Design a protein around this ligand. Structure first.
Ligand SMILES: [K+]
Ligand SMILES: [K+]
Ligand SMILES: [K+]
Ligand SMILES: [K+]
Ligand SMILES: [K+]
Ligand SMILES: [K+]
Ligand SMILES: [Mg+2]
Ligand SMILES: [Mg+2]
Ligand SMILES: [Mg+2]
Ligand SMILES: [Mg+2]
Ligand SMILES: [Mg+2]
Ligand SMILES: [Mg+2]
Ligand SMILES: [Mg+2]
Ligand SMILES: [Mg+2]
Ligand SMILES: [Mg+2]
Ligand SMILES: [Mg+2]
Ligand SMILES: [Mg+2]
Ligand SMILES: [Mg+2]
Ligand SMILES: [Mg+2]
Ligand SMILES: [Mg+2]
Ligand SMILES: [Mg+2]
Ligand SMILES: [Mg+2]
Ligand SMILES: [Mg+2]
Ligand SMILES: [Mg+2]
Ligand SMILES: [Mg+2]
Ligand SMILES: [Mg+2]
Ligand SMILES: [Mg+2]
Ligand SMILES: [Mg+2]
Ligand SMILES: [Mg+2]
Ligand SMILES: [Mg+2]
Ligand SMILES: [Mg+2]
Ligand SMILES: [Mg+2]
Ligand SMILES: [Mg+2]
Ligand SMILES: [Mg+2]
Ligand SMILES: [Mg+2]
Ligand SMILES: [Mg+2]
Ligand SMILES: [Mg+2]
Ligand SMILES: [Mg+2]
Ligand SMILES: [Mg+2]
Lengths: 164, 85, 240, 202, 77
RNA sequence: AGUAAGGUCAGCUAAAUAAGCUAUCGGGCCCAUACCCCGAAAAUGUUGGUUAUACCCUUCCCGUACUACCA
RNA sequence: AACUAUUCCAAAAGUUAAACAACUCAACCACAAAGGGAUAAAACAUAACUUAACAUGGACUAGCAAUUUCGGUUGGGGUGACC
RNA sequence: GUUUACCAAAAACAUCACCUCUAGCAUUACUAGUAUUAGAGGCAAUGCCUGCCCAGUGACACCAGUUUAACGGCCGCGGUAUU
RNA sequence: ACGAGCUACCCAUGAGCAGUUUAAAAGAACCAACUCAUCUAUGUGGCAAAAUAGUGAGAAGACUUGUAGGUAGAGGUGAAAA
């Protein structure tokens, strides 16, 4: 494991984050850290953002996961592609890997019009699927999660409870 | 003023060494006298000023043995007479 | 014991002033520069380096002066010329062919097109033509002439870009300077000072140079023909 | 300030007597230098609101160099002495009892400053009919200007908008400061396409 | 320009005043009481010397404009 | 005198896997010679000891080399 | 070592800050663009750079220079040899 | 011309000449000067000349590299025209 | 700590070089004052802790010389004789 990417993993972990909407009704995203964590709220917000930013109801949610696919031992593990079919496939899918190996993966989850319960269930399957490559408990495998739609930005999913 | 050992080894050469404080040029404001003095101060003096929460507090709280400056004693005497009078 | 420098005169005067030799001894009294001492007694002439200097501030316009005589100055290797105008006289460095009964124009008005370059006129570098030979270069506006004053030394203007002039010093080193600095057109007088031949060891003693020491020093690594690239241009323009 | 200790031990003198000092007791060694330490921060109470720091009467742990050079000499802040803190704490009680602070939090003041000079691009797609409501307008702040806006805070001019144009939006922070920001409704563009067309070209 | 004075040859400026004179409302302690120099005591500041009775030789030269025949117009002699 | 130090095909070099070039011998090309192309032969100064030899040591022999100073 | 000169780091002073690689295969839209098939996060938990003259601490290079010695036996010492 | 005053007055040192090297510039030296200038050195007028060599060392460049009017260097063995 | 009243060099301020030969005040020439000290002989506790006698080199210059000041031992000064 190179020390350059170890610094990157330390940097992303050091990014501040806070729970809930602050006291100020209107505030800058620069001034206050990320607030949106709930998966159910995030899925509803993406559907809401579809109404706010009027587009097609069907949108492919290409989730970005800042997965810690490194720092198992002093020698880094190699990328692979584990294929596991989702319980609610969108209308076996390969798990692609970053060309730059910057510890982030872009894998489609499901369509926007799918219910939040099914999409969240697909998310839980993805979390277990990606960790199958290195299921060891020596080092954490997931650092941050960012769920973005086709016409929306990602949200910092509170993925820590869903890790086990 | 003192000596030192090169490479911090006892069996090495004995060398005369002089350590000098780093001096800075600052102008300070005193509320009692309402005048600005351009005084050669050190980083430790500024830390003591912040520790005492005031330039006037630093002069009036630190004793003679802690100040070790005739300008400081005269500065204290000027302000001490200001309060009493 | 601390000594006192002879440079105590405060008011400018054309007449020669008394001068005391040093001999390489600093104010303390120890030798600092060797091979100096025992020269012929000399008098110093007060040389006015700043070419543009009006008599009064009431009329800051350009003025024209007249050359009276060209004399020999023991201190410098060039020839100085007496110049009178208005109610004052000045000793200024004479160019290659300055003679008696001649008129010299001093000006600072930077004109757009050009100004004809005469052999004695002093004009700012912004108004001189591109291909002009200059001497008595003023490094900064109002500072005075410091560069190019030896006998036969002349610098050549190169180009004027974004209101800034670039000149070539006699050492073939480019120098950048603001175009408003005053400079003199021409070559410094006494052109054949380099071709002068000293006939005997005594003539060196008359000039004031003592003989070198007799210690035999083996040459080190510093010696030998060194080929080095020209250093970059020296610029006195302060970029904000 | 240097800190040194003697190489050779000094014999004791326990009756309040000055000990005997020898030449070998002059040999020091540098154990630590105070200028090489990672220096701390200085906490100060602000007596006037700063552009990027907190507001009038707030606690900020600013850098030590800044406090002694521009904050304290200019009167923008005062030393955070324990006696000085309670003066501001008691001062807050008077205003907040009757809701008279109107000073905003440390970030709240910066929100006003940014919104004073800002422009929002409300990108709408004409392929489907769109109606602008305060919930929609708050979305564009988060994406374009990076501003999180409460849905109730926005006060639209109450005129339904169905075509692109120029309008105004009223933004209120903490119910104390009201800011009227320019509104620019233009056709929506994909940021990947938008940045390619304009930023990459120019 | 190039002024013709030299720092060493020119008369030195007066030494800086002692720090005691800078403290408002504080009478300095000087050695003027013992009318001789003493280390550790502040240097006194004296008013300009004013001889009650004028002396011809030892007085300062009067200014040129003090002469009754002084005139603003510049005459050349 | 002492010390240093070397010998290898006819010759000069490099390796101890005794090779490379040239010379020598035989053949081809040309009117003939040389060049050139092709093929073959050829050695570890000497004695002894180095598992056994060779690069090593020893003995013999030739030749090379430095130094021989203060009074 | 000091000292002189060269270079780096630290101290000190100051300056600026919230960010870029689509391409429509279908197809909406009179345009300009659009929607489906991604438009993230992040910049760094401060960061980056400059700093005249003086000047402190810790290193690098060079100049100059400081401290101290230069074994023994030997048919006199050196040389060769020996311990 | 100069030197070991008090055992060496010289073939030694200096010297006109030639050449190399380092420096773009202000209030006490150099200098009240500014590269035809001023320092750190070598060799000795003039005349004819100053050959080859950057491997090593040193210096510069501070990287490749460049420098000997920088310190310094500037070859063996064997055969071959009657002798 | 004290010493540049001798000596090495320099900064001030002064003072000397007659005759002779040459368009010459030319680091030219003959020869005094003057300044150095080549060779030999006396002298060797001597007149002298470096001299006397004879003989010599320069003698308008990089020359002699008076007064006074400056540089001080890890240094000063030096047409290098340590
Ligand atoms: K001259
Ligand atoms: K014997
Ligand atoms: K002689
Ligand atoms: K070389
Ligand atoms: K003296
Ligand atoms: K006598
Ligand atoms: Mg001169
Ligand atoms: Mg010379
Ligand atoms: Mg010599
Ligand atoms: Mg006891
Ligand atoms: Mg240091
Ligand atoms: Mg010792
Ligand atoms: Mg020995
Ligand atoms: Mg012995
Ligand atoms: Mg013997
Ligand atoms: Mg031996
Ligand atoms: Mg002679
Ligand atoms: Mg002698
Ligand atoms: Mg003599
Ligand atoms: Mg003699
Ligand atoms: Mg020649
Ligand atoms: Mg010759
Ligand atoms: Mg010679
Ligand atoms: Mg010779
Ligand atoms: Mg040669
Ligand atoms: Mg080379
Ligand atoms: Mg004397
Ligand atoms: Mg005569
Ligand atoms: Mg003569
Ligand atoms: Mg005699
Ligand atoms: Mg005699
Ligand atoms: Mg006789
Ligand atoms: Mg004679
Ligand atoms: Mg003669
Ligand atoms: Mg003394
Ligand atoms: Mg010495
Ligand atoms: Mg001499
Ligand atoms: Mg010698
Ligand atoms: Mg000797």
């Amino acid at each position: 494991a190179s020390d350059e990417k170890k610094d990157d993993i330390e940097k992303i972990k050091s990014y501040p984050f806070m729970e809930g909407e602050p006291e100020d009704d209107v505030y800058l995203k620069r001034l206050y850290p990320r607030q949106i964590y709930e998966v159910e709220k995030a899925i509803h917000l993406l559907k809401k953002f579809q109404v706010l930013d009027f587009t097609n109801p069907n949108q492919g949610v290409y989730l970005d996961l800042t997965l810690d696919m490194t720092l198992g031992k002093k020698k880094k593990v190699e990328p692979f592609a584990s294929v596991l079919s989702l319980p609610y496939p969108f209308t076996g899918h390969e798990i692609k890997v970053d060309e730059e190996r910057e510890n982030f993966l872009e894998t489609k989850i499901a369509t926007l019009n799918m219910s939040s319960d099914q999409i969240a269930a697909n998310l839980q399957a993805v979390i277990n699927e990606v960790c199958r490559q290195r299921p060891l408990n020596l080092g954490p495998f997931v650092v941050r999660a960012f769920l973005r739609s086709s016409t929306s930005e990602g949200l910092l999913i509170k993925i820590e409870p869903l890790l086990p | 003023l003192g000596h030192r050992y090169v490479n911090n080894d006892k069996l090495s050469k004995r060398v005369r060494k002089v350590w000098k404080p780093q001096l800075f040029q600052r102008e300070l404001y005193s509320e009692i006298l309402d005048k600005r003095f351009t005084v050669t101060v050190t980083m430790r003096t500024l830390d003591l000023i912040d520790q005492a929460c005031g330039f006037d507090f630093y002069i009036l709280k630190t004793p003679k043995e802690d100040l070790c400056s005739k300008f400081g004693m005269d500065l204290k005497r000027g302000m001490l007479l200001r309060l009493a009078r | 014991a601390t000594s006192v420098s002879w440079k105590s005169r405060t008011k400018y005067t054309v007449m020669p002033v008394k001068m005391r030799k040093s001999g390489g001894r600093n104010h303390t009294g120890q030798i600092q520069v060797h091979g100096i001492g025992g020269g012929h007694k000399q008098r110093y002439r007060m040389i006015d380096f700043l070419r543009f200097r009006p008599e009064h501030e009431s009329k800051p316009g350009p003025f024209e002066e007249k050359v009276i005589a060209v004399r020999y100055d023991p201190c410098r290797s060039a020839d100085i010329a007496l110049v009178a105008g208005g109610n004052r006289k000045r000793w200024i460095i004479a160019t290659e062919n300055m003679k008696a009964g001649d008129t010299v124009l001093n000006s600072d008005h930077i004109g757009r097109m050009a100004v004809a370059a005469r052999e004695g006129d002093a004009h700012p570098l912004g108004a001189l033509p591109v291909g002009t030979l200059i001497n008595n270069v003023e490094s900064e506006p109002g500072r005075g002439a410091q560069y190019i004053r030896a006998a036969g030394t002349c610098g050549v203007l190169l180009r004027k870009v974004n209101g800034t002039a670039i000149i070539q010093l006699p050492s073939k080193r480019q120098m950048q300077v603001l175009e408003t600095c005053i400079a003199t057109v021409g070559r410094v007088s006494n052109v054949d000072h380099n071709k002068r031949v000293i006939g005997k060891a005594g003539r060196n003693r008359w000039l004031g140079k003592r003989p070198n020491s007799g210690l035999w020093q083996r040459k080190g690594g510093w010696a030998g023909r060194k080929i080095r690239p020209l250093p970059p241009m020296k610029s006195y323009v302060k970029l904000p | 300030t240097v800190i040194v200790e003697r190489w050779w031990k000094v014999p004791l003198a326990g009756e309040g007597r000055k000990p005997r000092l020898h030449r070998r007791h002059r040999v020091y060694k540098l154990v630590e230098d105070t200028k090489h330490r990672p220096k701390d921060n200085l906490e100060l109470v602000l007596t006037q609101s700063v552009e990027e720091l907190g507001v009038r009467g707030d606690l900020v742990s600013v850098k030590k160099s800044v406090g002694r050079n521009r904050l304290l000499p200019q009167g923008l802040a005062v030393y955070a002495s324990p006696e000085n803190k309670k003066l501001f704490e008691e001062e807050k009680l008077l205003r907040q009892e009757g809701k008279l602070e109107k000073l905003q939090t440390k970030a709240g003041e910066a929100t006003v400053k940014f919104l004073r000079r800002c422009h929002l691009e409300v990108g709408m797609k004409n392929n489907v009919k769109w109606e602008l409501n305060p919930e929609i307008v708050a979305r564009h702040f988060l994406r374009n200007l990076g501003v999180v806006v409460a849905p109730h805070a926005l006060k639209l001019p109450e005129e339904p908008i169905t075509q692109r144009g120029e309008y105004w939006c009223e933004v209120t922070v903490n119910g104390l400061d009201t800011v009227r920001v320019p509104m620019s409704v233009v056709n929506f563009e994909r940021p990947k396409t938008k940045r390619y067309k304009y930023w990459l070209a120019q | 320009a190039y002024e013709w004075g030299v720092r060493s040859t020119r008369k030195p400026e007066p030494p800086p005043l002692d720090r005691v004179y800078e403290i408002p409302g504080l009478e300095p302690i000087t050695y003027a009481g013992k009318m001789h120099f003493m280390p550790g005591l502040a240097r006194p500041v004296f008013p300009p010397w004013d001889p009650g009775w004028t002396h011809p030789k030892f007085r300062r030269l009067p200014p040129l404009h003090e002469h009754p025949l002084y005139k603003d117009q510049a005459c050349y002699v």
